[PDB]
Design a protein around this ligand. Structure first.
Ligand code: ZN
Ligand code: ZN
Ligand code: ZN
Ligand code: ZN
Ligand code: ZN
Ligand code: ZN
Lengths: 254, 254, 254, 254, 254, 254
């Protein structure tokens, strides 16, 4: 694979240098647009673009999407600092779309676990929009020490048992110091027309965070990309994985 | 009974040597077929064939189906290595069919517990297909030690409390290192036509794993063979067994 | 048309005779590159070359790719024996490229079945690289007689029921006498970017054998040439013809 | 076509003379069996048998099933009289099976109206068994005159307005003089497995009379032959035909 | 307006002469195609084409769609006879699409009654496919006289009281002589997204006949053209019109 | 193999030369029967005859039925001109029968595509007898130039977009210059009686042209010979290959 430091470099280079068929510096422009008075909170990257410019890296995104996405976001940040002298920009997401293969929900095997997959389906349900504690901040009631603990929207809350400074077992989550983002669950499944007669359609539950929340309603036909996550299903006696799609990019089909 | 080492021997011998009424070396042929470009993941063995060739062993399959099946699978593996020079073949299941007795669901007594029974019925329900963690791999966050723990689809997840190398109570299940296979629950019961008027039909729940998942729909009339498992029913106050059929082979009736 | 006897000669001419715009015997050159420290197992023949030199034969490899390719491979083999005193080289593929017409996946029709087509597309997925028994040698264990069954990579392993000599059924596959090569499946489709608004992209499955496996990854834009095969579906429920592309030559699009 | 008199002749001849591949006089035997102490109330005729013996007649059965069946039944009657000296035998049905084409329910077009079609499907519903007034006998309360009026199980009761002898408008149906037979409605439709994904299965309602009543339960997979009848659907505003299958023969599939 | 005779003329002329931007004689070609081995049963005409060629006529189609469509169909027939020497072609529908205005369901006012409107909506429901008696044929049981009576899929069956030849009140509908076509009801309504918050969406019921039956499922977004029909709603005490869309052309939106 | 030039000669020999066990020039006889008061439009060539006389050519009509048949029909045509001074006779079909191998419908595989096969089966249904434009002659209305498009009965009417002479798009189909013949579709399947317990019977669709239409009815046991064609499905939703049998000769089973 490719270590983080070097991905950031390669990504930063891609954003700056990539140009399309007509010579348009697509991502330079997208990043420039971040200086507009009401900017976007993400930059969508066409996987095919990245694959034609630095293929080895493009495949790393699919193999290690967590590090891949993270590096890409770190690069956006340094391009904003080095090329636009903007520091206070806040989080900008890297959302990859147009992957080489589109799976049906039924195709999502366990060989995909923790990779970036692209799935086409119809939205069966959407949850209500709630605040997800993306960063929990715990505060000791004795020394007043602060412990930052990032969370994952598919795993249960990672608490702290004792203070990392004064060993005290008197800590609570500080609701104000903690950071919260929008969260919305949804479900997609294969449409019956895509299957054989009397075949039971399969489904998968996803998570939308931040700015891609509330972009789809039930009945919508979508192409999502995301990391396939598995967590142990507590509904079952025996160890069964419950699949969750942590969505990286979502758009309707046409 | 018969110890494992000797079963493997006897099984390997059976697979190589058995020939039917016309002199066809059935199982030699079935195993040869495993070298085709898209092979099966199991070898179905006609219990009657095995009984006519090594009857003592055939009865051992019914008495100790767990060791019996395992030995048969280990034999398949050594026949592939010794006779076909194939090592990387992966798991091939031994699925025994055509047992001497066919039970109705109502006939399944506790004298069958952990034996291989053959049941005829009609499928009342099928579950959704899920990934069952057939092999859990735990990883220590301190020494990075790896512990392999195989699972059973009818028992709850067997965790590990502390590291087996550095005694550390800081281990988690590694979702990527673990192996998962397909899983599907189903229910069969006796058809009313087979019973007396106003008799309440009885049912039993089964498990299908791997490649025999999704081979039956509700309304289907099947003959399954499988190990009868009992686990303590948590629904009841008092100790009651909940029967589960861990399916070894399934086919529709004709 | 041309019978295969005469093709071998006409090809062996072409290989020796053909000279480019500079008077170099290109294909004489390529043939020698098969005698290097580590050689090549293929000779890439430009179709335009064969056309400008023996237009009738060039038109023939398209109408009858199987005999066309086979005859050229026989000519390569006699030019080794006759012009370089080498008959130990083994199988050398003749891979034709730069054909007169280029199809999009959607343009593939019934008129191409068993003809050499050239398809431009993007790779959707690629399979695991596995061994394919390309020539099966069956040995009767009774009389010792050998039987040679050649295989097609798009059909399942074809066997022999009884010994053609002594009628016996006690036969086995001799893995040593048999020939195996690498196999890799892959899928290409038309690039959504070359299609109308909501036009579903057409896809086709390919086969790569021997020295052209592992040549491509998903996302690769390629030009394959190959024989269109139709194969009867394995699923025995009023089955139907699916199409496979047996790849003859594959290079990335320029 | 063929007039009634001549059909009866040809049918009578067929029953007597037909012999199968082994020289068995199948229908002679079936009719002989009618002299057993507890006889059947119908004779099933294999359409293929009749087609091989008197093809012109076999096609007449399908074209005019009402006259065809009737003639066949009249012939059975005269064979019983002329060859077995039995008169008091009662009604014996001619039930033709094994027609040349099997329709799915969705294939039943209006070009079938009043022809003998053969349909395969799954029974969705069965009605309760009721007595159908196959022959209504009306009796004048003035002159005591009796009027016989046969009925059809798909049309409403054909009454009489006035006495055919004394012109009196004082007639009622005589419940005792009238003849009643068993009647049972049922519904078959195509199974989802036979259709495309998300395709709405179509159905048709049938009538079973006399001795073929209560031979099928819901869930059963049947092949029925019958005359397709249409009557004006009163549920609709506009003129729509409601299809009814008046079953001639029914058997489960295998 | 324009009398029938003259419309047919003008239409026939349009079909023969019209050419598009590239000089393609679109409708000449569409009609030529009717001589293929498996032809269509309708010719779709782009209203815009007709408007650019004979605008006065195009507006007549909207004003009097019943005469307009009929004339267009009569013209198709005479073009087939005069230009292709085909008489036995059967009914070919004229289906106009792409009208100048697209109404939402809520826009369908009574000023549209018996005009050709074009509506966009989402299919809420579809009925089961039934045979509609498009032509009832009545037969006198006395003189055997035949009376043809065409029907409309939105009006109740138009019977005949007495024979038009022997004045006899003894006539019945002859189910075999009558002609039946496919029929399917459906409902479309405006999607909530197209309306204001908390606005109750409005709907309309349609009829599909013949070859445009079963071309839409619930959830489909369609653009239909059709004659708006009103019939007196029998559900209400007071005189209220029930709107019905007699569909002339339907296609999904993109 | 054999080029068509040489086939014509080899066939014209066979027709003149071949003599039976009694020394009669059978095919000379059959050719004259084309000059009777009312003649025949076909010459039924027994494959066994052609085989025992010119084994290489006989094997050729099977491998290349289209050129084989075509060449024989050219030879028939020159033997008329040369041996009987007749060149006004018009198309005479060469219909080959009594082929070496007989397939059941289920035995038809991809290896038969575009080869002459012989299938025994029973007729399930037969179509309406309609006209098929076998040769379309297109006349440009601007410059007067004629263009000849030959047709296949298993594809749709192929046309010409613009005049090859003057580039004009003002083209029309000249029905008089064009050739049409009768067409009838039919379906045969294996007889359930030659199949196992619950074995679904396989079916195939055939085409009868010209003088072999109306030759069979449902229920007829027949032996057809013909070219297996695969045609790309008209339904443009990832379409697939269906198989049609273009019938060369058909007779009832003896
Ligand atoms: Zn503290
Ligand atoms: Zn440890
Ligand atoms: Zn031998
Ligand atoms: Zn009276
Ligand atoms: Zn009358
Ligand atoms: Zn011209």
């Amino acid at each position: 694979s490719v270590d983080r430091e070097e991905m950031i470099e390669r990504f930063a280079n891609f954003l700056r240098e990539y140009t399309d068929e007509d010579g348009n510096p697509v991502y330079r422009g997208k990043i420039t647009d971040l200086l507009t008075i009401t900017p976007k909170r993400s930059v969508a990257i066409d996987w095919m673009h990245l694959n034609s410019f630095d293929s080895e890296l493009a495949h790393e995104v699919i193999e290690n999407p967590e590090e891949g996405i993270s590096a890409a976001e770190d690069a956006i940040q340094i391009v904003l600092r080095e090329d636009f002298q903007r520091e206070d920009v806040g989080k900008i997401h890297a959302r990859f779309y147009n992957l080489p293969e589109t799976l049906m929900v039924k195709d999502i095997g366990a060989e995909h676990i923790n990779k970036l997959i692209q799935v086409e389906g119809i939205v069966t349900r959407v949850g209500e929009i709630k605040p997800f504690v993306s960063v929990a901040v715990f505060v000791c009631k004795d020394c007043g020490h602060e412990m930052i603990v990032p969370q994952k929207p598919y795993e249960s809350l990672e608490k702290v048992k004792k203070c990392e400074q004064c060993g005290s077992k008197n800590i609570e989550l500080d609701v104000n110091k903690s950071s919260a983002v929008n969260f919305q669950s949804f479900r997609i499944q294969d449409r019956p027309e895509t299957l054989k007669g009397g075949e039971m359609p399969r489904f998968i539950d996803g998570i939308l965070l931040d700015d891609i929340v509330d972009v789809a309603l039930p009945g919508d036909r979508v192409i999502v990309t995301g990391i396939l996550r598995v967590v142990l299903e507590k509904r079952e006696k025996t160890p069964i994985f419950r699949k969750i799609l942590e969505v990286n990019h979502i758009e309707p089909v046409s």
